[PDB]
Amino acid sequence: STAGKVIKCKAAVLWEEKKPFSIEEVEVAPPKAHEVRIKMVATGICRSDDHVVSGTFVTPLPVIAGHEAAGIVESIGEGVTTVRPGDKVIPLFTPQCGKCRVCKHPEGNFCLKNDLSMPRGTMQDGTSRFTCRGKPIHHFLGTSTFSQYTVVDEISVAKIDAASPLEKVCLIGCGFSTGYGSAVKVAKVTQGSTCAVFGLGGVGLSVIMGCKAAGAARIIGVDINKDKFAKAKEVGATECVNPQDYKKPIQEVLTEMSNGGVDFSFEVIGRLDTMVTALSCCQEAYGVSVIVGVPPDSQNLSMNPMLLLSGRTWKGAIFGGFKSKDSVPKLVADFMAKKFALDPLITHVLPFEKINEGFDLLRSGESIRTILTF
Amino acid sequence: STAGKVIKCKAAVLWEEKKPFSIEEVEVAPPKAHEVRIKMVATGICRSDDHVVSGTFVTPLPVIAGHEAAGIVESIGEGVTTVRPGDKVIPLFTPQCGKCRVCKHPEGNFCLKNDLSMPRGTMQDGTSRFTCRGKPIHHFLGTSTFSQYTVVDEISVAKIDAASPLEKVCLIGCGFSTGYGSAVKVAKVTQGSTCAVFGLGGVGLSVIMGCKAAGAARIIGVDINKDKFAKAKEVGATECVNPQDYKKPIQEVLTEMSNGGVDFSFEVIGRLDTMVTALSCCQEAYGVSVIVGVPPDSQNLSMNPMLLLSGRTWKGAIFGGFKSKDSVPKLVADFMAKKFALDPLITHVLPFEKINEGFDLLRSGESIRTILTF
Ligand SMILES: NC(=O)c1ccc[n+]([C@@H]2O[C@H](COP(=O)([O-])OP(=O)([O-])OC[C@H]3O[C@@H](n4cnc5c(N)[nH+]cnc54)[C@H](O)[C@@H]3O)[C@@H](O)[C@H]2O)c1
Ligand SMILES: NC(=O)c1ccc[n+]([C@@H]2O[C@H](COP(=O)([O-])OP(=O)([O-])OC[C@H]3O[C@@H](n4cnc5c(N)[nH+]cnc54)[C@H](O)[C@@H]3O)[C@@H](O)[C@H]2O)c1
Ligand SMILES: [Zn+2]
Ligand SMILES: [Zn+2]
Ligand SMILES: [Zn+2]
Ligand SMILES: [Zn+2]
């Protein structure tokens, strides 16, 4: 039995920004009280993991990244009540402690125990469970899924259906749930509305899925890579536009196309300029714009507050507004009942050992989601 | 009889920015089709009128300003069906055409016929009804209430209760309705919540009234003029704070006071820095911030979009979100039924001839609302 023992396993360590991951042996400590050690089965490559590499999202290095994943519990620390060894689980990059003022609020989900606002790269107790070459290695968002084994706090894991296909449902740990919830929960897209979705990657495609599920009449996809348009239309886009094709700014184009502005817009890229464009293209009196993309570290946008005074609503969210531990198992159950599809997001499959090729695919524009198998 | 004739009457003409109003004779043309000529009874001094004087709010000059008022219909043009001679009325600086996409939307109120976005300073037909010393004089927001008589489009006037005290209910034409609706309709303040209100002038006091009516448990008033605090507490503030008293930025103070951020914040001043402060002091995961203050012309704010990505909602509104022609008569009926008070907003009552003394009271910090009586 490995219970109570250090596990030696392979992980993808990021020693430096703007460098390939290093696949090499790490030591994974056993779980302490209220911790869970997970044998990973599948993990997706999310652009947010690439943001760690590029320095767009600052978190302490060296680090084991990865946050979109599914696995099987290897062991539980003292006092764990919500999972058992052998359970299928999805790590939760947004925890759900159940006790803070956000967890108790009917509409909050950004639990105060998160490691996203001001990342420390540790477990809840301020320490690390990972050693590599004798050196402590940081965690990422309390998940660190680019490893054959990880250790997470109990508030950062959800038990899911024992019959779940882990190589699909790992996407419920980030990209699918984020995009879908941003439409259905955060924006609250209405039947018959017109939506504009900026960025047609895995998260933007999931936004489109949610807009279509909510009954939008028009869903306009916006991307500078026209190779993204075919899949966007397959999952519900009615029109796609490439800003590079137009002489005028795309907010003017979208305002014209929607006969005075869209009902709902979504920024699903991570650029300051497209956050402001996406706000501007929603109707000035009653439009809603949702920021989903992660902005570059410490940079401020500039905007004219008259865009809000006329009546627009501007909001953002983490993880589609879903309370993570309550919602992830329900989303898996709904997937099992065919209430939504995940295959449209999966364009590539690789073994974990080919993680760097998976990041190459994302950076070239060729992939939506690559799923890595351990 | 005056019907069908030019009226020569007294008005307050603003010939150029940053000068006193000139109280002098103007000619007021009779109403054309679908227009209404009103004998003014009372008009309030709103900070937005001072924004015209100061160049904070750009509108064509020379101009008859004034937009918060009540009067009696003198005559109606062909085709008017909603008011008759002798009716008490409130001019609507936000029209309600009933035909545009905003008017048809359940939550929109910023009718596309407004003259606020891109001010032309005319009637709907692109012409003026005012002459002074042989020169055409612009309208202001389709109202122009600093005149013994004005002409408005039918979509810019509402009939109110014949028994209405016009020297009080003129405030339903702007300041009361704007603040009250910003709380009850735009923010949708909840029972038991904590609110922060930046700016304790007539509009901010009306926000406090709305927050109290909605059942807020805590209402924190914020002003650099501590002379505003006593009246803020009278109408429902539980605490007041002056940013000048603190070594820390007031967003940090308010976050500490509210044990992690307020539920609802309101910017009721018109400064870029307080718009960002007000957003920052609402709880990062579920807080709502409403911009009510009018920003200085053409100036952009700077902010970190992580404030929104965590879950905040940022919105603004004109006229408290109220559909103007539907709402103004109901607000007057509610005032007549003692559902809210207006006297706390009224600090001074002067003859119209003292308009410049009324503006000096506002600029000195000494008044909330001055009502001018014709
Ligand atoms: N809020 C959350 O909880 C959360 C969760 C998951 C992802 N994210 C972020 O969401 C964003 C999208 O992630 P993803 O879908 O994995 O990324 P992705 O697959 O890189 O997709 C981004 C898309 O944006 C397109 N694009 C780039 N620049 C422009 C431009 N100027 N105009 C229009 N399109 C452009 C690009 O071609 C690509 O198809 C990233 O910033 C992520 O970090 C946020
Ligand atoms: N959105 C709308 O439809 C609408 C309607 C009416 C008024 N307005 C605007 O709302 C704002 C308030 O109008 P009002 O109540 O008539 O004005 P007001 O009576 O001048 O009140 C403004 C208050 O802000 C206070 N103040 C000034 N600077 C600061 C600061 N740095 N920090 C905190 N307090 C400060 C000031 O002392 C005063 O008590 C103005 O910008 C108006 O133009 C908007
Ligand atoms: Zn929590
Ligand atoms: Zn992600
Ligand atoms: Zn209209
Ligand atoms: Zn006003």
Side-chain angles (χ1 to χ4, degrees), chain A residues 46-48 51 174 178 199-203 222-225 228 268-271 292-294 317-319 362 369, chain B residues 309:
Chain A
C46 173
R47 176 62 68 170
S48 303
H51 288 340
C174 184
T178 294
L200 303 176
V203 184
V222 184
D223 204 303
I224 58 169
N225 183 356
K228 298 291 168 176
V268 207
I269 305 161
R271 296 176 59 83
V292 187
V294 165
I318 304 298
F319 196 58
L362 177 71
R369 285 297 202 259
Chain B
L309 199 68

PDB file of all heavy atoms in Angstrom, chain A residues 46-48 51 174 178 199-203 222-225 228 268-271 292-294 317-319 362 369, chain B residues 309, ligand 1:
ATOM      1  N   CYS A  46      -5.466  23.946 -20.784  1.00  0.00           N
ATOM      2  CA  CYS A  46      -6.262  25.193 -20.815  1.00  0.00           C
ATOM      3  C   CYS A  46      -5.309  26.359 -21.113  1.00  0.00           C
ATOM      4  O   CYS A  46      -4.138  26.308 -20.714  1.00  0.00           O
ATOM      5  CB  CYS A  46      -6.974  25.409 -19.474  1.00  0.00           C
ATOM      6  SG  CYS A  46      -7.843  26.983 -19.272  1.00  0.00           S
ATOM      7  N   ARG A  47      -5.767  27.351 -21.830  1.00  0.00           N
ATOM      8  CA  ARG A  47      -4.884  28.529 -22.066  1.00  0.00           C
ATOM      9  C   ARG A  47      -4.418  29.100 -20.742  1.00  0.00           C
ATOM     10  O   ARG A  47      -3.310  29.669 -20.734  1.00  0.00           O
ATOM     11  CB  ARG A  47      -5.663  29.539 -22.892  1.00  0.00           C
ATOM     12  CG  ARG A  47      -4.953  30.858 -23.151  1.00  0.00           C
ATOM     13  CD  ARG A  47      -3.669  30.738 -23.929  1.00  0.00           C
ATOM     14  NE  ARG A  47      -3.905  30.338 -25.292  1.00  0.00           N
ATOM     15  CZ  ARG A  47      -3.009  30.340 -26.246  1.00  0.00           C
ATOM     16  NH1 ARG A  47      -1.744  30.574 -25.950  1.00  0.00           N
ATOM     17  NH2 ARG A  47      -3.372  30.134 -27.491  1.00  0.00           N
ATOM     18  N   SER A  48      -5.139  28.974 -19.645  1.00  0.00           N
ATOM     19  CA  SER A  48      -4.645  29.537 -18.373  1.00  0.00           C
ATOM     20  C   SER A  48      -3.353  28.839 -17.942  1.00  0.00           C
ATOM     21  O   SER A  48      -2.511  29.483 -17.284  1.00  0.00           O
ATOM     22  CB  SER A  48      -5.660  29.456 -17.272  1.00  0.00           C
ATOM     23  OG  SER A  48      -6.846  30.115 -17.650  1.00  0.00           O
ATOM     24  N   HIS A  51      -0.796  30.608 -19.695  1.00  0.00           N
ATOM     25  CA  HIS A  51      -0.550  31.924 -19.081  1.00  0.00           C
ATOM     26  C   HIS A  51       0.511  31.832 -17.996  1.00  0.00           C
ATOM     27  O   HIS A  51       1.188  32.842 -17.743  1.00  0.00           O
ATOM     28  CB  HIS A  51      -1.854  32.478 -18.505  1.00  0.00           C
ATOM     29  CG  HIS A  51      -2.861  32.928 -19.490  1.00  0.00           C
ATOM     30  ND1 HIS A  51      -2.575  33.244 -20.795  1.00  0.00           N
ATOM     31  CD2 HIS A  51      -4.178  33.170 -19.312  1.00  0.00           C
ATOM     32  CE1 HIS A  51      -3.684  33.667 -21.376  1.00  0.00           C
ATOM     33  NE2 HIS A  51      -4.701  33.655 -20.475  1.00  0.00           N
ATOM     34  N   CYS A 174     -12.722  22.747 -15.873  1.00  0.00           N
ATOM     35  CA  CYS A 174     -12.446  24.141 -16.191  1.00  0.00           C
ATOM     36  C   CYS A 174     -13.214  24.605 -17.413  1.00  0.00           C
ATOM     37  O   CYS A 174     -14.194  25.361 -17.270  1.00  0.00           O
ATOM     38  CB  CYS A 174     -10.967  24.480 -16.328  1.00  0.00           C
ATOM     39  SG  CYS A 174     -10.874  26.291 -16.619  1.00  0.00           S
ATOM     40  N   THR A 178     -16.780  26.670 -17.187  1.00  0.00           N
ATOM     41  CA  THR A 178     -16.571  28.115 -17.214  1.00  0.00           C
ATOM     42  C   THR A 178     -17.400  28.751 -18.323  1.00  0.00           C
ATOM     43  O   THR A 178     -18.113  29.729 -18.091  1.00  0.00           O
ATOM     44  CB  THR A 178     -15.086  28.438 -17.423  1.00  0.00           C
ATOM     45  OG1 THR A 178     -14.328  27.995 -16.286  1.00  0.00           O
ATOM     46  CG2 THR A 178     -14.853  29.929 -17.594  1.00  0.00           C
ATOM     47  N   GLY A 199     -13.614  35.246 -28.973  1.00  0.00           N
ATOM     48  CA  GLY A 199     -12.702  34.130 -28.701  1.00  0.00           C
ATOM     49  C   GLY A 199     -13.405  32.811 -28.818  1.00  0.00           C
ATOM     50  O   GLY A 199     -14.380  32.558 -28.100  1.00  0.00           O
ATOM     51  N   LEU A 200     -12.932  31.978 -29.733  1.00  0.00           N
ATOM     52  CA  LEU A 200     -13.607  30.717 -30.101  1.00  0.00           C
ATOM     53  C   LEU A 200     -12.699  29.528 -29.797  1.00  0.00           C
ATOM     54  O   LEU A 200     -12.676  28.529 -30.543  1.00  0.00           O
ATOM     55  CB  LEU A 200     -14.046  30.769 -31.560  1.00  0.00           C
ATOM     56  CG  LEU A 200     -14.962  31.928 -31.895  1.00  0.00           C
ATOM     57  CD1 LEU A 200     -15.271  31.959 -33.388  1.00  0.00           C
ATOM     58  CD2 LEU A 200     -16.277  31.873 -31.100  1.00  0.00           C
ATOM     59  N   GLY A 201     -11.995  29.590 -28.670  1.00  0.00           N
ATOM     60  CA  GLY A 201     -11.289  28.449 -28.086  1.00  0.00           C
ATOM     61  C   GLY A 201     -12.238  27.570 -27.290  1.00  0.00           C
ATOM     62  O   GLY A 201     -13.453  27.718 -27.384  1.00  0.00           O
ATOM     63  N   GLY A 202     -11.679  26.696 -26.483  1.00  0.00           N
ATOM     64  CA  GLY A 202     -12.527  25.761 -25.741  1.00  0.00           C
ATOM     65  C   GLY A 202     -13.521  26.502 -24.858  1.00  0.00           C
ATOM     66  O   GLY A 202     -14.684  26.056 -24.730  1.00  0.00           O
ATOM     67  N   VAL A 203     -13.093  27.582 -24.218  1.00  0.00           N
ATOM     68  CA  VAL A 203     -14.027  28.288 -23.313  1.00  0.00           C
ATOM     69  C   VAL A 203     -15.075  29.027 -24.126  1.00  0.00           C
ATOM     70  O   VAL A 203     -16.281  28.963 -23.796  1.00  0.00           O
ATOM     71  CB  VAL A 203     -13.256  29.168 -22.336  1.00  0.00           C
ATOM     72  CG1 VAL A 203     -14.215  29.791 -21.356  1.00  0.00           C
ATOM     73  CG2 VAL A 203     -12.196  28.362 -21.620  1.00  0.00           C
ATOM     74  N   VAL A 222     -16.670  35.708 -32.768  1.00  0.00           N
ATOM     75  CA  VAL A 222     -15.673  36.703 -33.177  1.00  0.00           C
ATOM     76  C   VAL A 222     -14.305  36.092 -32.911  1.00  0.00           C
ATOM     77  O   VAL A 222     -13.997  35.757 -31.759  1.00  0.00           O
ATOM     78  CB  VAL A 222     -15.842  38.031 -32.430  1.00  0.00           C
ATOM     79  CG1 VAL A 222     -14.850  39.043 -32.976  1.00  0.00           C
ATOM     80  CG2 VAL A 222     -17.268  38.557 -32.511  1.00  0.00           C
ATOM     81  N   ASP A 223     -13.479  35.954 -33.939  1.00  0.00           N
ATOM     82  CA  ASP A 223     -12.111  35.437 -33.742  1.00  0.00           C
ATOM     83  C   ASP A 223     -11.266  35.980 -34.894  1.00  0.00           C
ATOM     84  O   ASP A 223     -11.757  36.075 -36.019  1.00  0.00           O
ATOM     85  CB  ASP A 223     -12.105  33.908 -33.635  1.00  0.00           C
ATOM     86  CG  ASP A 223     -10.902  33.355 -32.896  1.00  0.00           C
ATOM     87  OD1 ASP A 223      -9.739  33.639 -33.326  1.00  0.00           O
ATOM     88  OD2 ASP A 223     -11.101  32.656 -31.873  1.00  0.00           O
ATOM     89  N   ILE A 224     -10.009  36.262 -34.610  1.00  0.00           N
ATOM     90  CA  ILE A 224      -9.048  36.641 -35.676  1.00  0.00           C
ATOM     91  C   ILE A 224      -8.507  35.417 -36.401  1.00  0.00           C
ATOM     92  O   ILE A 224      -7.846  35.620 -37.448  1.00  0.00           O
ATOM     93  CB  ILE A 224      -7.900  37.481 -35.108  1.00  0.00           C
ATOM     94  CG1 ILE A 224      -7.128  36.764 -33.996  1.00  0.00           C
ATOM     95  CG2 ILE A 224      -8.414  38.844 -34.715  1.00  0.00           C
ATOM     96  CD1 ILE A 224      -5.830  37.465 -33.608  1.00  0.00           C
ATOM     97  N   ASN A 225      -8.789  34.204 -35.949  1.00  0.00           N
ATOM     98  CA  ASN A 225      -8.392  32.953 -36.615  1.00  0.00           C
ATOM     99  C   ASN A 225      -9.636  32.333 -37.234  1.00  0.00           C
ATOM    100  O   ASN A 225     -10.422  31.676 -36.545  1.00  0.00           O
ATOM    101  CB  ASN A 225      -7.717  32.029 -35.614  1.00  0.00           C
ATOM    102  CG  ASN A 225      -7.228  30.762 -36.278  1.00  0.00           C
ATOM    103  OD1 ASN A 225      -7.459  30.543 -37.471  1.00  0.00           O
ATOM    104  ND2 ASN A 225      -6.543  29.924 -35.511  1.00  0.00           N
ATOM    105  N   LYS A 228     -11.199  28.781 -36.700  1.00  0.00           N
ATOM    106  CA  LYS A 228     -12.037  28.477 -35.529  1.00  0.00           C
ATOM    107  C   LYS A 228     -13.526  28.505 -35.879  1.00  0.00           C
ATOM    108  O   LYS A 228     -14.330  28.106 -35.053  1.00  0.00           O
ATOM    109  CB  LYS A 228     -11.718  29.498 -34.428  1.00  0.00           C
ATOM    110  CG  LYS A 228     -10.291  29.487 -33.928  1.00  0.00           C
ATOM    111  CD  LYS A 228      -9.894  28.278 -33.148  1.00  0.00           C
ATOM    112  CE  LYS A 228      -8.392  28.249 -32.977  1.00  0.00           C
ATOM    113  NZ  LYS A 228      -7.973  27.119 -32.118  1.00  0.00           N
ATOM    114  N   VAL A 268     -13.745  36.304 -24.143  1.00  0.00           N
ATOM    115  CA  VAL A 268     -13.242  34.947 -23.856  1.00  0.00           C
ATOM    116  C   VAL A 268     -11.840  34.780 -24.460  1.00  0.00           C
ATOM    117  O   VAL A 268     -11.527  33.748 -25.056  1.00  0.00           O
ATOM    118  CB  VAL A 268     -14.237  33.840 -24.247  1.00  0.00           C
ATOM    119  CG1 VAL A 268     -13.987  32.634 -23.356  1.00  0.00           C
ATOM    120  CG2 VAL A 268     -15.674  34.299 -24.134  1.00  0.00           C
ATOM    121  N   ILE A 269     -11.046  35.827 -24.289  1.00  0.00           N
ATOM    122  CA  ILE A 269      -9.681  35.875 -24.878  1.00  0.00           C
ATOM    123  C   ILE A 269      -8.664  36.197 -23.790  1.00  0.00           C
ATOM    124  O   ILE A 269      -7.742  35.395 -23.540  1.00  0.00           O
ATOM    125  CB  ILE A 269      -9.569  36.927 -26.000  1.00  0.00           C
ATOM    126  CG1 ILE A 269     -10.626  36.706 -27.079  1.00  0.00           C
ATOM    127  CG2 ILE A 269      -8.153  36.893 -26.564  1.00  0.00           C
ATOM    128  CD1 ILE A 269     -10.860  37.919 -27.927  1.00  0.00           C
ATOM    129  N   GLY A 270      -8.825  37.342 -23.131  1.00  0.00           N
ATOM    130  CA  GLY A 270      -7.809  37.847 -22.197  1.00  0.00           C
ATOM    131  C   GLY A 270      -7.035  39.023 -22.760  1.00  0.00           C
ATOM    132  O   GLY A 270      -5.817  39.062 -22.559  1.00  0.00           O
ATOM    133  N   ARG A 271      -7.735  39.946 -23.394  1.00  0.00           N
ATOM    134  CA  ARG A 271      -7.088  41.198 -23.821  1.00  0.00           C
ATOM    135  C   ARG A 271      -7.858  42.374 -23.268  1.00  0.00           C
ATOM    136  O   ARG A 271      -9.087  42.417 -23.335  1.00  0.00           O
ATOM    137  CB  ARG A 271      -7.041  41.300 -25.335  1.00  0.00           C
ATOM    138  CG  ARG A 271      -6.203  40.243 -26.009  1.00  0.00           C
ATOM    139  CD  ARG A 271      -6.292  40.371 -27.511  1.00  0.00           C
ATOM    140  NE  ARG A 271      -5.854  41.667 -27.983  1.00  0.00           N
ATOM    141  CZ  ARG A 271      -4.605  42.016 -28.192  1.00  0.00           C
ATOM    142  NH1 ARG A 271      -3.622  41.131 -28.113  1.00  0.00           N
ATOM    143  NH2 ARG A 271      -4.361  43.261 -28.546  1.00  0.00           N
ATOM    144  N   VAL A 292     -14.655  36.890 -19.235  1.00  0.00           N
ATOM    145  CA  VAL A 292     -14.191  35.523 -18.913  1.00  0.00           C
ATOM    146  C   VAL A 292     -12.682  35.419 -19.042  1.00  0.00           C
ATOM    147  O   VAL A 292     -12.038  34.679 -18.276  1.00  0.00           O
ATOM    148  CB  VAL A 292     -14.922  34.478 -19.774  1.00  0.00           C
ATOM    149  CG1 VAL A 292     -14.557  33.068 -19.314  1.00  0.00           C
ATOM    150  CG2 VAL A 292     -16.423  34.684 -19.734  1.00  0.00           C
ATOM    151  N   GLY A 293     -12.101  36.079 -20.038  1.00  0.00           N
ATOM    152  CA  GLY A 293     -10.663  35.940 -20.254  1.00  0.00           C
ATOM    153  C   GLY A 293      -9.821  36.494 -19.112  1.00  0.00           C
ATOM    154  O   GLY A 293     -10.209  37.447 -18.422  1.00  0.00           O
ATOM    155  N   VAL A 294      -8.631  35.921 -18.946  1.00  0.00           N
ATOM    156  CA  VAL A 294      -7.735  36.327 -17.845  1.00  0.00           C
ATOM    157  C   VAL A 294      -6.828  37.420 -18.357  1.00  0.00           C
ATOM    158  O   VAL A 294      -6.169  37.223 -19.374  1.00  0.00           O
ATOM    159  CB  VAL A 294      -6.894  35.160 -17.350  1.00  0.00           C
ATOM    160  CG1 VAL A 294      -5.714  35.580 -16.473  1.00  0.00           C
ATOM    161  CG2 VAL A 294      -7.817  34.182 -16.595  1.00  0.00           C
ATOM    162  N   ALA A 317     -16.539  36.651 -14.106  1.00  0.00           N
ATOM    163  CA  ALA A 317     -16.701  35.483 -13.214  1.00  0.00           C
ATOM    164  C   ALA A 317     -15.528  34.548 -13.388  1.00  0.00           C
ATOM    165  O   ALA A 317     -14.952  34.426 -14.481  1.00  0.00           O
ATOM    166  CB  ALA A 317     -18.003  34.769 -13.481  1.00  0.00           C
ATOM    167  N   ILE A 318     -15.316  33.794 -12.336  1.00  0.00           N
ATOM    168  CA  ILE A 318     -14.433  32.617 -12.324  1.00  0.00           C
ATOM    169  C   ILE A 318     -15.302  31.367 -12.403  1.00  0.00           C
ATOM    170  O   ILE A 318     -16.344  31.288 -11.716  1.00  0.00           O
ATOM    171  CB  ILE A 318     -13.544  32.637 -11.057  1.00  0.00           C
ATOM    172  CG1 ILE A 318     -12.726  33.914 -10.934  1.00  0.00           C
ATOM    173  CG2 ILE A 318     -12.692  31.388 -10.982  1.00  0.00           C
ATOM    174  CD1 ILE A 318     -11.765  34.079 -12.075  1.00  0.00           C
ATOM    175  N   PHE A 319     -14.905  30.411 -13.225  1.00  0.00           N
ATOM    176  CA  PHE A 319     -15.534  29.077 -13.245  1.00  0.00           C
ATOM    177  C   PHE A 319     -17.023  29.211 -13.509  1.00  0.00           C
ATOM    178  O   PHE A 319     -17.829  28.411 -12.983  1.00  0.00           O
ATOM    179  CB  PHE A 319     -15.221  28.276 -11.975  1.00  0.00           C
ATOM    180  CG  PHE A 319     -15.491  26.807 -12.096  1.00  0.00           C
ATOM    181  CD1 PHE A 319     -14.868  26.057 -13.084  1.00  0.00           C
ATOM    182  CD2 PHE A 319     -16.321  26.138 -11.212  1.00  0.00           C
ATOM    183  CE1 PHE A 319     -15.118  24.704 -13.209  1.00  0.00           C
ATOM    184  CE2 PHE A 319     -16.546  24.779 -11.339  1.00  0.00           C
ATOM    185  CZ  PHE A 319     -15.919  24.072 -12.322  1.00  0.00           C
ATOM    186  N   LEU A 362      -1.601  24.112 -28.964  1.00  0.00           N
ATOM    187  CA  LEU A 362      -2.443  25.243 -28.514  1.00  0.00           C
ATOM    188  C   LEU A 362      -1.845  26.535 -29.088  1.00  0.00           C
ATOM    189  O   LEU A 362      -2.577  27.354 -29.644  1.00  0.00           O
ATOM    190  CB  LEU A 362      -2.464  25.289 -26.987  1.00  0.00           C
ATOM    191  CG  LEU A 362      -3.258  26.463 -26.417  1.00  0.00           C
ATOM    192  CD1 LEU A 362      -4.762  26.274 -26.637  1.00  0.00           C
ATOM    193  CD2 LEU A 362      -2.928  26.683 -24.959  1.00  0.00           C
ATOM    194  N   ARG A 369      -9.112  21.723 -27.285  1.00  0.00           N
ATOM    195  CA  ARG A 369      -8.549  21.012 -26.121  1.00  0.00           C
ATOM    196  C   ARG A 369      -7.807  19.770 -26.584  1.00  0.00           C
ATOM    197  O   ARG A 369      -8.338  18.906 -27.287  1.00  0.00           O
ATOM    198  CB  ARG A 369      -9.673  20.669 -25.136  1.00  0.00           C
ATOM    199  CG  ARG A 369     -10.169  21.859 -24.331  1.00  0.00           C
ATOM    200  CD  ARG A 369      -9.078  22.441 -23.453  1.00  0.00           C
ATOM    201  NE  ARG A 369      -9.544  23.210 -22.329  1.00  0.00           N
ATOM    202  CZ  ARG A 369      -9.593  24.541 -22.255  1.00  0.00           C
ATOM    203  NH1 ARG A 369      -9.327  25.294 -23.317  1.00  0.00           N
ATOM    204  NH2 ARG A 369      -9.962  25.076 -21.095  1.00  0.00           N
TER     205      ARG A 369
ATOM    206  N   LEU B 309     -13.493  40.174 -12.839  1.00  0.00           N
ATOM    207  CA  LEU B 309     -13.341  38.717 -13.064  1.00  0.00           C
ATOM    208  C   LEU B 309     -13.688  37.924 -11.817  1.00  0.00           C
ATOM    209  O   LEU B 309     -14.219  36.817 -11.916  1.00  0.00           O
ATOM    210  CB  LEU B 309     -11.910  38.401 -13.515  1.00  0.00           C
ATOM    211  CG  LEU B 309     -11.767  37.041 -14.202  1.00  0.00           C
ATOM    212  CD1 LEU B 309     -12.460  36.969 -15.551  1.00  0.00           C
ATOM    213  CD2 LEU B 309     -10.310  36.658 -14.383  1.00  0.00           C
TER     214      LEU B 309
HETATM  215  N1  LIG C   1     -12.718  33.039 -15.909  1.00  0.00           N
HETATM  216  C1  LIG C   1     -12.326  31.757 -15.787  1.00  0.00           C
HETATM  217  O1  LIG C   1     -12.643  31.059 -14.806  1.00  0.00           O
HETATM  218  C2  LIG C   1     -11.517  31.165 -16.857  1.00  0.00           C
HETATM  219  C3  LIG C   1     -11.508  29.761 -17.099  1.00  0.00           C
HETATM  220  C4  LIG C   1     -10.908  29.233 -18.198  1.00  0.00           C
HETATM  221  C5  LIG C   1     -10.230  30.073 -19.069  1.00  0.00           C
HETATM  222  N2  LIG C   1     -10.103  31.390 -18.789  1.00  0.00           N
HETATM  223  C6  LIG C   1      -9.479  32.301 -19.740  1.00  0.00           C
HETATM  224  O2  LIG C   1     -10.312  32.389 -20.891  1.00  0.00           O
HETATM  225  C7  LIG C   1      -9.481  32.695 -22.046  1.00  0.00           C
HETATM  226  C8  LIG C   1      -9.796  31.725 -23.148  1.00  0.00           C
HETATM  227  O3  LIG C   1      -9.285  30.420 -22.789  1.00  0.00           O
HETATM  228  P1  LIG C   1      -9.274  29.269 -23.895  1.00  0.00           P
HETATM  229  O4  LIG C   1     -10.553  29.201 -24.609  1.00  0.00           O
HETATM  230  O5  LIG C   1      -8.680  28.078 -23.233  1.00  0.00           O
HETATM  231  O6  LIG C   1      -8.143  29.949 -24.908  1.00  0.00           O
HETATM  232  P2  LIG C   1      -7.803  29.793 -26.413  1.00  0.00           P
HETATM  233  O7  LIG C   1      -8.062  28.430 -26.902  1.00  0.00           O
HETATM  234  O8  LIG C   1      -6.436  30.413 -26.557  1.00  0.00           O
HETATM  235  O9  LIG C   1      -8.874  30.680 -27.168  1.00  0.00           O
HETATM  236  C9  LIG C   1      -8.712  32.106 -27.313  1.00  0.00           C
HETATM  237  C10 LIG C   1      -9.206  32.490 -28.713  1.00  0.00           C
HETATM  238  O10 LIG C   1      -9.078  33.912 -28.794  1.00  0.00           O
HETATM  239  C11 LIG C   1      -8.764  34.202 -30.144  1.00  0.00           C
HETATM  240  N3  LIG C   1      -8.196  35.530 -30.203  1.00  0.00           N
HETATM  241  C12 LIG C   1      -6.950  35.958 -29.847  1.00  0.00           C
HETATM  242  N4  LIG C   1      -6.848  37.285 -30.005  1.00  0.00           N
HETATM  243  C13 LIG C   1      -8.029  37.733 -30.491  1.00  0.00           C
HETATM  244  C14 LIG C   1      -8.561  39.035 -30.900  1.00  0.00           C
HETATM  245  N5  LIG C   1      -7.873  40.135 -30.838  1.00  0.00           N
HETATM  246  N6  LIG C   1      -9.833  39.027 -31.267  1.00  0.00           N
HETATM  247  C15 LIG C   1     -10.606  37.927 -31.342  1.00  0.00           C
HETATM  248  N7  LIG C   1     -10.162  36.696 -31.053  1.00  0.00           N
HETATM  249  C16 LIG C   1      -8.889  36.643 -30.616  1.00  0.00           C
HETATM  250  C17 LIG C   1      -7.786  33.107 -30.538  1.00  0.00           C
HETATM  251  O11 LIG C   1      -7.583  33.019 -31.943  1.00  0.00           O
HETATM  252  C18 LIG C   1      -8.387  31.878 -29.852  1.00  0.00           C
HETATM  253  O12 LIG C   1      -9.176  31.085 -30.716  1.00  0.00           O
HETATM  254  C19 LIG C   1      -8.033  32.704 -21.545  1.00  0.00           C
HETATM  255  O13 LIG C   1      -7.599  34.014 -21.170  1.00  0.00           O
HETATM  256  C20 LIG C   1      -8.112  31.897 -20.264  1.00  0.00           C
HETATM  257  O14 LIG C   1      -7.054  32.161 -19.362  1.00  0.00           O
HETATM  258  C21 LIG C   1     -10.807  31.952 -17.764  1.00  0.00           C
END
